[PDB]
Amino acid sequence: RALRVLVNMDGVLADFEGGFLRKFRARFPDQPFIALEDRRGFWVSEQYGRLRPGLSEKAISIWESKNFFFELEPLPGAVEAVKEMASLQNTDVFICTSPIKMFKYCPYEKYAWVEKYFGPDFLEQIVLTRDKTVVSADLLIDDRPDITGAEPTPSWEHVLFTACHNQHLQLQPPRRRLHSWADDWKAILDSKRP
Amino acid sequence: RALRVLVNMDGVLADFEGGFLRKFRARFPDQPFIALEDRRGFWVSEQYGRLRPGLSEKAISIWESKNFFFELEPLPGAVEAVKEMASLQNTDVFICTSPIKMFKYCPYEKYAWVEKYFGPDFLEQIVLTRDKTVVSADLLIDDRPDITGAEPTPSWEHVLFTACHNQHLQLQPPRRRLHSWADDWKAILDSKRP
Ligand SMILES: Cc1cn([C@H]2C=C[C@@H](COP(=O)(O)O)O2)c(=O)[nH]c1=O
Ligand SMILES: Cc1cn([C@H]2C=C[C@@H](COP(=O)(O)O)O2)c(=O)[nH]c1=O
Ligand SMILES: [Mg+2]
Ligand SMILES: [Mg+2]
Ligand SMILES: [Mg+2]
Ligand SMILES: [Mg+2]
C-alpha cells in the first residue's frame, strides 16, 4: 500500500568516490591514482590493484581508517531529495547500506552521518546488510550494477544511480537509471504506484 | 529455492535478560529489580518504570553502556544450533537484530559478538534494522510477540522464541513457538520446505 523505496548510501547519498580520491592522494602523494572520469567498475580496490601491485591494500586502508565514512560529503541534491521523498504521502524510504568487513568504525559512522544530515528520527530508516536482495521494497536506487545475494528474485526494481564507475555502462533493457538527484526521481517513483 | 531463516539476536542468541539483570544489580545494588520469573512484556524499561519512578532511565543506561552487548553470554544451544542450521543443505540463515537509539557501541559490539561465536565469515549474514517486516524470508525466530513495521504482510512466518517475558503469553492460532534451542527447530524448518 505505501510505496517502499530503498536508497543506497555510498555512491548515492554519500560521495564515496570523491572522498576516497581526496584522502588517497593526501595520504599517498607518490602513488598513481585513478581520476574519477577514468573510474570503471564498482570495486575501487580491484581497479587500483590493476594499476599497480600493493595499491589494492593501500586503497582499502583509506576506507578502513577512522572518519572516512563520517566525513563523506553528501552528493548534490541527495539530502534535499530524500527528505522530500520521505515526506511524500504513501511513501516509505529506507537507507540501505553495506558495511565493510572491518567493523570498528563503519557501522557507527554511517549512523552518525545519517543523524547529521537527516536528524535522529531518520535513524529508524537504516538497514545495514551485505545482502540487499533479502530486503523487500518496490524500488532500490543503487550505483552498483550487479546486485545479487540469497534471494534470486528480489521484490524491488533496481534503478541504477549514475556514478563515474558506471556512467559508460550499457544496461540490458528494461533496466533504467536515475541520472543524479537533479533527475526526475518523482517520475520513477510514480511509475511504480497503482 | 533455499529456505531462508532470520534468527533474532537479543533474547534468542544472546542472553539480554540475564546480562541486563546482572549488570543492573551490580550497578544499582540499592534499587529494586525484576527477577527473570517475574518479567512480563518485551520492554524491560517499561516494566522497570512501573516498578519505580526513575528506573526506566537507570535500566536504559545499562544497555547504553560500553561492553553491554559484547559481554552477553550465548543462550544454551544457540551457537551450536545456528551453526548446524546454516550448514544444512538448501538453508540460508541471517542474524536479524535491532540496534538501540544510541549507536556508539551497539552496532560495533554486535558485529564483534557474531565474529567471536560464529567466525569472520558469518558477518556477511547480519542484517541490522529497526524494521524486520521489510526483511523477506520463510521464517523469523524472535522473542518479541508483536513484530510490526512498514510492510503490513511480511513474507516470513514469525515463530515466537520463548523467553521469561513471553512464556505465559497465550498466542492466537496458528502462531507457534520454538521453546528453546533444545526444542526441535529442524522440524519447524522442515515444515516450511517443499
Ligand atoms: C568501492 C568499494 C567499496 N567497498 C565497501 C565500502 C563501502 C561499501 C559500499 O557498498 P554499497 O552499500 O554502496 O553497495 O562497500 C569495498 O569493500 N571495496 C570497494 O572497492
Ligand atoms: C528489552 C529492551 C530492549 N531494547 C533494545 C536493545 C536491544 C534490542 C533488542 O531488540 P530485538 O532485536 O531482540 O527485537 O532492543 C530497548 O530499547 N528497550 C528494552 O526495553
Ligand atoms: Mg553504493
Ligand atoms: Mg512518507
Ligand atoms: Mg529479541
Ligand atoms: Mg546452508
PDB file of N, CA and C in Angstrom, chain B residues 152-183:
ATOM      1  N   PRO B 152       2.852  -4.403   5.818  1.00  0.00           N
ATOM      2  CA  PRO B 152       1.718  -4.997   6.544  1.00  0.00           C
ATOM      3  C   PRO B 152       1.625  -6.509   6.418  1.00  0.00           C
ATOM      4  N   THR B 153       2.200  -7.092   5.371  1.00  0.00           N
ATOM      5  CA  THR B 153       2.137  -8.522   5.157  1.00  0.00           C
ATOM      6  C   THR B 153       3.530  -9.122   4.898  1.00  0.00           C
ATOM      7  N   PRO B 154       4.303  -9.326   5.976  1.00  0.00           N
ATOM      8  CA  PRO B 154       5.683  -9.840   5.866  1.00  0.00           C
ATOM      9  C   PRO B 154       5.704 -11.205   5.207  1.00  0.00           C
ATOM     10  N   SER B 155       6.766 -11.540   4.495  1.00  0.00           N
ATOM     11  CA  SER B 155       6.814 -12.829   3.834  1.00  0.00           C
ATOM     12  C   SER B 155       7.073 -13.978   4.841  1.00  0.00           C
ATOM     13  N   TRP B 156       7.721 -13.685   5.974  1.00  0.00           N
ATOM     14  CA  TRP B 156       8.057 -14.743   6.927  1.00  0.00           C
ATOM     15  C   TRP B 156       6.865 -15.165   7.794  1.00  0.00           C
ATOM     16  N   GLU B 157       6.926 -16.400   8.266  1.00  0.00           N
ATOM     17  CA  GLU B 157       6.199 -16.811   9.468  1.00  0.00           C
ATOM     18  C   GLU B 157       7.060 -16.506  10.736  1.00  0.00           C
ATOM     19  N   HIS B 158       6.499 -15.766  11.674  1.00  0.00           N
ATOM     20  CA  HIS B 158       7.115 -15.475  12.963  1.00  0.00           C
ATOM     21  C   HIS B 158       6.892 -16.624  13.923  1.00  0.00           C
ATOM     22  N   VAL B 159       7.973 -17.321  14.273  1.00  0.00           N
ATOM     23  CA  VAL B 159       7.953 -18.324  15.343  1.00  0.00           C
ATOM     24  C   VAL B 159       8.475 -17.644  16.586  1.00  0.00           C
ATOM     25  N   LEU B 160       7.633 -17.605  17.622  1.00  0.00           N
ATOM     26  CA  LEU B 160       7.996 -16.943  18.874  1.00  0.00           C
ATOM     27  C   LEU B 160       8.990 -17.782  19.652  1.00  0.00           C
ATOM     28  N   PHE B 161      10.189 -17.239  19.857  1.00  0.00           N
ATOM     29  CA  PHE B 161      11.174 -17.885  20.719  1.00  0.00           C
ATOM     30  C   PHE B 161      10.851 -17.574  22.175  1.00  0.00           C
ATOM     31  N   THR B 162      10.741 -18.630  22.981  1.00  0.00           N
ATOM     32  CA  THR B 162      10.380 -18.484  24.382  1.00  0.00           C
ATOM     33  C   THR B 162      11.429 -17.748  25.176  1.00  0.00           C
ATOM     34  N   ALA B 163      10.936 -16.833  26.011  1.00  0.00           N
ATOM     35  CA  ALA B 163      11.725 -16.057  26.931  1.00  0.00           C
ATOM     36  C   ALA B 163      10.869 -15.802  28.172  1.00  0.00           C
ATOM     37  N   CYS B 164      11.525 -15.550  29.308  1.00  0.00           N
ATOM     38  CA  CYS B 164      10.874 -15.113  30.542  1.00  0.00           C
ATOM     39  C   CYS B 164       9.729 -14.130  30.305  1.00  0.00           C
ATOM     40  N   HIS B 165       9.922 -13.107  29.451  1.00  0.00           N
ATOM     41  CA  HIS B 165       8.903 -12.055  29.325  1.00  0.00           C
ATOM     42  C   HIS B 165       7.654 -12.530  28.573  1.00  0.00           C
ATOM     43  N   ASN B 166       7.783 -13.607  27.779  1.00  0.00           N
ATOM     44  CA  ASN B 166       6.677 -14.106  26.934  1.00  0.00           C
ATOM     45  C   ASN B 166       6.166 -15.524  27.271  1.00  0.00           C
ATOM     46  N   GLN B 167       6.778 -16.207  28.236  1.00  0.00           N
ATOM     47  CA  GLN B 167       6.465 -17.610  28.434  1.00  0.00           C
ATOM     48  C   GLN B 167       5.027 -17.844  28.854  1.00  0.00           C
ATOM     49  N   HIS B 168       4.368 -16.839  29.443  1.00  0.00           N
ATOM     50  CA  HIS B 168       2.995 -17.032  29.886  1.00  0.00           C
ATOM     51  C   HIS B 168       2.010 -16.628  28.863  1.00  0.00           C
ATOM     52  N   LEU B 169       2.488 -16.094  27.738  1.00  0.00           N
ATOM     53  CA  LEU B 169       1.584 -15.496  26.773  1.00  0.00           C
ATOM     54  C   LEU B 169       0.820 -16.514  25.966  1.00  0.00           C
ATOM     55  N   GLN B 170      -0.499 -16.356  25.922  1.00  0.00           N
ATOM     56  CA  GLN B 170      -1.289 -17.146  25.023  1.00  0.00           C
ATOM     57  C   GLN B 170      -1.288 -16.468  23.634  1.00  0.00           C
ATOM     58  N   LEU B 171      -0.854 -17.178  22.610  1.00  0.00           N
ATOM     59  CA  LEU B 171      -0.841 -16.651  21.254  1.00  0.00           C
ATOM     60  C   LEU B 171      -2.143 -16.994  20.548  1.00  0.00           C
ATOM     61  N   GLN B 172      -2.462 -16.253  19.510  1.00  0.00           N
ATOM     62  CA  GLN B 172      -3.593 -16.574  18.639  1.00  0.00           C
ATOM     63  C   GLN B 172      -3.166 -17.667  17.633  1.00  0.00           C
ATOM     64  N   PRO B 173      -3.923 -18.767  17.541  1.00  0.00           N
ATOM     65  CA  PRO B 173      -3.751 -19.735  16.440  1.00  0.00           C
ATOM     66  C   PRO B 173      -3.662 -19.009  15.087  1.00  0.00           C
ATOM     67  N   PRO B 174      -2.821 -19.389  14.121  1.00  0.00           N
ATOM     68  CA  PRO B 174      -1.912 -20.538  14.170  1.00  0.00           C
ATOM     69  C   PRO B 174      -0.472 -20.180  14.621  1.00  0.00           C
ATOM     70  N   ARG B 175      -0.278 -19.076  15.366  1.00  0.00           N
ATOM     71  CA  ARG B 175       1.073 -18.708  15.828  1.00  0.00           C
ATOM     72  C   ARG B 175       1.709 -19.781  16.698  1.00  0.00           C
ATOM     73  N   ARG B 176       3.006 -19.961  16.561  1.00  0.00           N
ATOM     74  CA  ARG B 176       3.697 -21.141  17.097  1.00  0.00           C
ATOM     75  C   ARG B 176       5.038 -20.769  17.733  1.00  0.00           C
ATOM     76  N   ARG B 177       5.599 -21.617  18.593  1.00  0.00           N
ATOM     77  CA  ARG B 177       6.764 -21.269  19.382  1.00  0.00           C
ATOM     78  C   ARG B 177       7.915 -22.178  19.078  1.00  0.00           C
ATOM     79  N   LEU B 178       9.130 -21.672  19.252  1.00  0.00           N
ATOM     80  CA  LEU B 178      10.289 -22.521  19.479  1.00  0.00           C
ATOM     81  C   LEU B 178      10.655 -22.347  20.927  1.00  0.00           C
ATOM     82  N   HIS B 179      10.616 -23.448  21.680  1.00  0.00           N
ATOM     83  CA  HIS B 179      10.656 -23.357  23.109  1.00  0.00           C
ATOM     84  C   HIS B 179      12.042 -22.993  23.686  1.00  0.00           C
ATOM     85  N   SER B 180      13.090 -23.403  23.011  1.00  0.00           N
ATOM     86  CA  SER B 180      14.471 -23.145  23.377  1.00  0.00           C
ATOM     87  C   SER B 180      15.223 -23.785  22.217  1.00  0.00           C
ATOM     88  N   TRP B 181      16.540 -23.694  22.207  1.00  0.00           N
ATOM     89  CA  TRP B 181      17.310 -24.271  21.130  1.00  0.00           C
ATOM     90  C   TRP B 181      17.395 -25.808  21.293  1.00  0.00           C
ATOM     91  N   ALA B 182      17.023 -26.341  22.465  1.00  0.00           N
ATOM     92  CA  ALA B 182      16.911 -27.799  22.668  1.00  0.00           C
ATOM     93  C   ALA B 182      15.661 -28.389  22.029  1.00  0.00           C
ATOM     94  N   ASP B 183      14.654 -27.554  21.834  1.00  0.00           N
ATOM     95  CA  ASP B 183      13.435 -27.871  21.120  1.00  0.00           C
ATOM     96  C   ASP B 183      13.800 -28.171  19.641  1.00  0.00           C
TER      97      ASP B 183
END
